Scaffold this motif. Sequence first.
Motif, PDB file in Angstrom:
ATOM      1  N   UNK A   2      43.247  46.780  40.947  1.00 15.53           N
ATOM      2  CA  UNK A   2      44.286  46.308  42.326  1.00 15.53           C
ATOM      3  C   UNK A   2      43.878  46.394  43.438  1.00 15.53           C
ATOM      4  N   UNK A   3      43.089  47.544  43.929  1.00 22.46           N
ATOM      5  CA  UNK A   3      43.141  47.942  45.308  1.00 22.46           C
ATOM      6  C   UNK A   3      41.929  46.957  45.949  1.00 22.46           C
ATOM      7  N   UNK A   4      40.771  47.034  44.833  1.00 21.66           N
ATOM      8  CA  UNK A   4      39.703  46.085  45.063  1.00 21.66           C
ATOM      9  C   UNK A   4      40.021  44.794  45.352  1.00 21.66           C
ATOM     10  N   UNK A   6      43.152  43.221  45.670  1.00 20.70           N
ATOM     11  CA  UNK A   6      44.263  42.846  46.670  1.00 20.70           C
ATOM     12  C   UNK A   6      44.746  43.399  47.977  1.00 20.70           C
ATOM     13  N   UNK A   7      43.651  44.726  48.232  1.00 19.89           N
ATOM     14  CA  UNK A   7      43.761  45.151  49.407  1.00 19.89           C
ATOM     15  C   UNK A   7      42.381  45.399  50.093  1.00 19.89           C
ATOM     16  N   UNK A   9      40.132  43.261  49.476  1.00 13.99           N
ATOM     17  CA  UNK A   9      39.963  41.473  49.549  1.00 13.99           C
ATOM     18  C   UNK A   9      41.680  41.170  49.433  1.00 13.99           C
ATOM     19  N   UNK A  10      41.750  39.805  49.188  1.00 12.09           N
ATOM     20  CA  UNK A  10      42.839  39.243  49.386  1.00 12.09           C
ATOM     21  C   UNK A  10      43.332  38.579  47.978  1.00 12.09           C
ATOM     22  N   UNK A  11      44.656  38.850  47.442  1.00 12.86           N
ATOM     23  CA  UNK A  11      44.951  38.176  46.169  1.00 12.86           C
ATOM     24  C   UNK A  11      45.808  36.940  46.452  1.00 12.86           C
ATOM     25  N   UNK A  13      49.142  35.016  44.603  1.00  9.97           N
ATOM     26  CA  UNK A  13      50.221  35.329  43.675  1.00  9.97           C
ATOM     27  C   UNK A  13      49.802  35.553  42.074  1.00  9.97           C
ATOM     28  N   UNK A  16      48.157  38.761  41.540  1.00  8.67           N
ATOM     29  CA  UNK A  16      48.753  39.831  41.520  1.00  8.67           C
ATOM     30  C   UNK A  16      49.727  40.121  40.295  1.00  8.67           C
TER      31      UNK A  16
ATOM     32  N   UNK B   1      53.442  32.215  49.178  1.00 11.73           N
ATOM     33  CA  UNK B   1      53.304  33.768  49.254  1.00 11.73           C
ATOM     34  C   UNK B   1      52.656  34.116  50.322  1.00 11.73           C
ATOM     35  N   UNK B   3      49.433  35.463  52.444  1.00 16.47           N
ATOM     36  CA  UNK B   3      47.950  35.540  52.158  1.00 16.47           C
ATOM     37  C   UNK B   3      47.319  36.617  52.972  1.00 16.47           C
ATOM     38  N   UNK B   4      47.490  38.060  52.591  1.00 12.97           N
ATOM     39  CA  UNK B   4      47.200  38.817  53.603  1.00 12.97           C
ATOM     40  C   UNK B   4      46.753  40.122  52.756  1.00 12.97           C
ATOM     41  N   UNK B   5      46.157  41.058  53.245  1.00 10.71           N
ATOM     42  CA  UNK B   5      45.552  42.362  52.483  1.00 10.71           C
ATOM     43  C   UNK B   5      46.807  43.087  52.404  1.00 10.71           C
ATOM     44  N   UNK B   6      47.117  43.556  51.117  1.00  6.22           N
ATOM     45  CA  UNK B   6      48.192  44.376  50.842  1.00  6.22           C
ATOM     46  C   UNK B   6      47.793  45.533  50.067  1.00  6.22           C
ATOM     47  N   UNK B   7      48.210  46.630  50.960  1.00  6.88           N
ATOM     48  CA  UNK B   7      47.709  47.899  50.638  1.00  6.88           C
ATOM     49  C   UNK B   7      48.893  48.844  50.584  1.00  6.88           C
ATOM     50  N   UNK B  11      51.526  47.077  48.842  1.00 10.67           N
ATOM     51  CA  UNK B  11      51.271  46.411  47.535  1.00 10.67           C
ATOM     52  C   UNK B  11      52.193  46.736  46.446  1.00 10.67           C
ATOM     53  N   UNK B  14      55.146  44.415  46.817  1.00  4.41           N
ATOM     54  CA  UNK B  14      54.773  43.231  46.189  1.00  4.41           C
ATOM     55  C   UNK B  14      54.962  43.105  44.818  1.00  4.41           C
ATOM     56  N   UNK B  15      54.256  43.999  44.032  1.00  2.00           N
ATOM     57  CA  UNK B  15      54.334  44.160  42.667  1.00  2.00           C
ATOM     58  C   UNK B  15      55.960  44.050  41.956  1.00  2.00           C
ATOM     59  N   UNK B  28      45.209  52.727  40.823  1.00  4.68           N
ATOM     60  CA  UNK B  28      44.514  52.654  41.651  1.00  4.68           C
ATOM     61  C   UNK B  28      42.880  53.212  41.576  1.00  4.68           C
TER      62      UNK B  28
END
Lengths: 21, 30
Positions: A2-4, A6-7, A9-11, A13, A16, B1, B3-7, B11, B14-15, B28
């Motif tokens: 998930x980090x690679x 969605x964080x 890079x961009x994910x 919906x 996710x 939804x 469209x951005x980096x979610x960290x 994150x 969001x889940x 992670x």
Amino acid sequence: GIVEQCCTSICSLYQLENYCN
Amino acid sequence: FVNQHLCGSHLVEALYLVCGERGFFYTPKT
Ligand SMILES: [Zn+2]
């Protein structure tokens, strides 16, 4: 993982939602 | 939804929102 996707890079919906149970 | 980096905590929130009753897994070092 998930980090690679969605964080780093961009994910969408849909991507996710692959991390839901 | 968005469209951005979610960290980090964003994150995880969001889940929690997207998955609802299903719940989710946050692993992670995958
Ligand atoms: Zn913040």
